Amino acid sequence: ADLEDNMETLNDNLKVIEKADNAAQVKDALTKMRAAALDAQKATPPKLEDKSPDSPEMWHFRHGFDILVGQIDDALKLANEGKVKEAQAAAEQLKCTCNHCHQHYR
Amino acid sequence: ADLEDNMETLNDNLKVIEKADNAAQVKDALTKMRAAALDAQKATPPKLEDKSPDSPEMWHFRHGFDILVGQIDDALKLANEGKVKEAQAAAEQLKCTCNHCHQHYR
Numbered sequence: 001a002d003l004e005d006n007m008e009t010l011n012d013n014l015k016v017i018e019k020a021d022n023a024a025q026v027k028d029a030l031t032k033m034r035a036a037a038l039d040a041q042k043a044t045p046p047k048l049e050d051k052s053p054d055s056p057e058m059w060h061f062r063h064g065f066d067i068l069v070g071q072i073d074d075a076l077k078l079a080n081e082g083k084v085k086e087a088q089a090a091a092e093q094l095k096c097t098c099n100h101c102h103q104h105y106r
Numbered sequence: 107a108d109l110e111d112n113m114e115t116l117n118d119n120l121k122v123i124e125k126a127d128n129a130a131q132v133k134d135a136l137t138k139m140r141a142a143a144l145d146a147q148k149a150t151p152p153k154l155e156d157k158s159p160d161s162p163e164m165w166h167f168r169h170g171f172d173i174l175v176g177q178i179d180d181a182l183k184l185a186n187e188g189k190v191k192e193a194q195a196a197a198e199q200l201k202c203t204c205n206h207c208h209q210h211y212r
């Protein structure tokens with residue numbers, strides 16, 4: 001999928017987690033976010049003029065998704081333990097990772 | 107100053123901005139935050155075992171302070187224009203930069 005689709009997958013599933021009732025719903029949404037993050041990691045920021053994979057800012061761009069995936073994995077551990085409220089709170093901590101990349105690249 | 111002092115300078119002055127009344131108070135606090143950020147940029151994260159300046163994660167650590175300084179400079183432009191409420195809102199956007207580095211390194 002393209003970057004827009006991957007970001008809206010992240011966006012919609014974060015909301016699903018917030019409104020979820022049980023561990024299975026949270027797990028399903030986090031699983032979809034993880035795949036969307038790794039897919040988006042292959043894209044480039046539109047406003048970044050230098051697209052070279054070896055450039056510092058492309059390393060930083062991909063690094064940001066590795067951090068996001070790590071946080072998603074933290075939340076998945078809680079969801080797999082059945083800790084719904086805890087997993088929802090962990091998903092809340094994602095938001096500053098989203099907002100940070102956005103401010104930096106958009 | 108050491109890392110602890112620099113972080114509490116950032117911490118206390120962010121609160122000063124939130125409670126400020128005029129552009130001069132906001133400007134003074136942002137100016138102190140900027141210096142504290144550049145000083146902290148010379149430190150290393152305690153829990154990072156590899157301290158080599160050329161390592162990717164030390165590049166990332168220093169990069170995070172350059173981003174923070176850029177955001178402080180955005181807020182300073184508004185404060186120097188007398189736009190108090192706008193500068194306070196810009197200081198609010200700093201928080202995800204703080205929280206992101208913290209989650210990543212602490």
Ligand code: HEC
Nearest residue numbers: 007010011014045046061064065068094097098101105106
């Ligand atoms: C964390 C969970 C999130 C969430 C919820 C979103 N993102 Fe991102 N994002 C990144 C870039 C470069 C863009 C610009 C895309 C473009 O200009 O084409 C975006 C954009 C978005 C949107 C807006 C989509 C739109 O309609 O324009 C949304 C809703 C969104 N994102 C959600 C880059 C990154 C990251 C790189 C390291 C990370 C992490 C995130 N985004 C994280 C998130």
Ligand code: HEC
Nearest residue numbers: 113116117120151152167170171174200203204207211212
């Ligand atoms: C943005 C405006 C902020 C604010 C308000 C704070 N920081 Fe940081 N910070 C960083 C690291 C590596 C640490 C660990 C320090 C240690 O373990 O010795 C901290 C710690 C803090 C604290 C806690 C101080 C304490 O009493 O333990 C506080 C209050 C704090 N910070 C405020 C690293 C970074 C960054 C690197 C890129 C950035 C940016 C920030 N911090 C940003 C902020």
Ligand SMILES: [Zn+2]
Nearest residue numbers: 004005007008
């Ligand atoms: Zn969209």
Ligand SMILES: [Zn+2]
Nearest residue numbers: 057060104169
């Ligand atoms: Zn960068």
Ligand SMILES: [Zn+2]
Nearest residue numbers: 110111113114
């Ligand atoms: Zn302290």
Ligand SMILES: [Zn+2]
Nearest residue numbers: 063163166210
């Ligand atoms: Zn890093």
Ligand SMILES: [Zn+2]
Nearest residue numbers: 060064166170
């Ligand atoms: Zn970063």
